[PDB]
């Protein structure tokens, strides 16, 4: 349980669990690579406990232009579809709690958990990049998520003794813009 703790002045916050560490009798507490208190021993029952910080991560918001609509979609990064918040009773610092946060359209991708967008089996051009080959766009009156399409399929008719030769041409003009000074 995500609780505070105080071990002989070692104040902190986190989740205490069982530890498999082969603690030696003279050893008080363990440490990790980062040189931080990773495990502790209870002063009373002399039990070794793991210390793990309460769950956290970044949150990103996906929206079209406000000139177009007002709906949004929220992406929880690195959160694995299950530890997303479910209670708002003074146990989270983000009151922008999604109206369902479950049951509704929830998609799990390699970039995190996406709530508020509908996955489709189609493929269009990328509009808003999400990550790991998943894009999102506002289509129809709703926000949907798809897998980006590299391009139209083609197959050159390679043959054993066949050639293709143009009979007309086109004169084309294109522009290129480059900064020169600041």
């Amino acid at each position: 349980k995500c609780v505070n703790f105080n071990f002989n002045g070692l104040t902190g916050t986190g989740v205490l669990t069982e530890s498999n560490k082969k603690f030696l009798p003279f050893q008080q507490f363990g440490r990790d690579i980062a040189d931080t208190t990773d495990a502790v021993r209870d002063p009373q029952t002399l039990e070794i406990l793991d210390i793990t910080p309460c769950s956290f991560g970044g949150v990103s918001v996906i929206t079209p232009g406000t000139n177009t609509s007002n709906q949004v979609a929220v992406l929880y990064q690195d959160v694995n579809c299950t530890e997303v918040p479910v209670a708002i009773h003074a146990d989270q610092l983000t009151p922008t709690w999604r109206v369902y946060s479950t049951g509704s359209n929830v998609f799990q991708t390699r970039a995190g958990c996406l709530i508020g967008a509908e996955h489709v089996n189609n493929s269009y051009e990328c509009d808003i990049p999400i990550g790991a080959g998943i894009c999102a766009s506002y289509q129809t009156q709703s926000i949907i998520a798809y897998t980006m399409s590299l391009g139209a399929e083609n197959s050159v008719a390679y043959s054993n003794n066949s050639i293709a030769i143009p009979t007309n041409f086109t004169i084309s003009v294109t522009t290129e813009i480059l900064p020169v000074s600041m």
């Binding site: 030769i165 041409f169 084309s172 290129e176 813009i177 900064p179 020169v180 600041m182």
Partner: protein, 195 residues
Amino acid sequence: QFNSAIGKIQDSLSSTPSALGKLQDVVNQNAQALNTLVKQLSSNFGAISSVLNDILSRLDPPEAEVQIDRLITGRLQSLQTYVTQQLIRAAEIRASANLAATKMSECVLGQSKRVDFCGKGYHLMSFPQSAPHGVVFLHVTYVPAQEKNFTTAPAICHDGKAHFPREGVFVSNGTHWFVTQRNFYEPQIITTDNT
């Protein structure tokens, strides 16, 4: 074809608003950086207040000096931070400027054979135009269209001697063989002058 292509250029820039995003980003980042430097004057940095006048007018010099050292060091950090980003950004601007100088020499003052360097297609010529904090090029390119289907052979055998094209390629519609240039269909009879 040339006049129509040049005509559609004005509408393409006017209609599409995000066409000049590359030049616009230069102006916005420079403006954004200056706004941050001004806004950073509002930070106490652990002192009692951000105003220098009241600190000196409310505490004795022996203890007020330590209060203003927090403000001076924090503000010097803002200036040092602001200069470091300017040096980095100017280095990437000079790289863009060098590419622009190279393109004007190679795509405007002559005809370039480097693929995709000046536009998409086979390069014909370029025209420069001046823009705020940058330049704009108009690449003119030759694009083939309306290809056809033909049967080809590497060499033509006649009188026990192999014949090869001099600067073209052998084609036939199915009954009669010709020689044509590679980029344009203009068939001709096979003689001893083109082979």
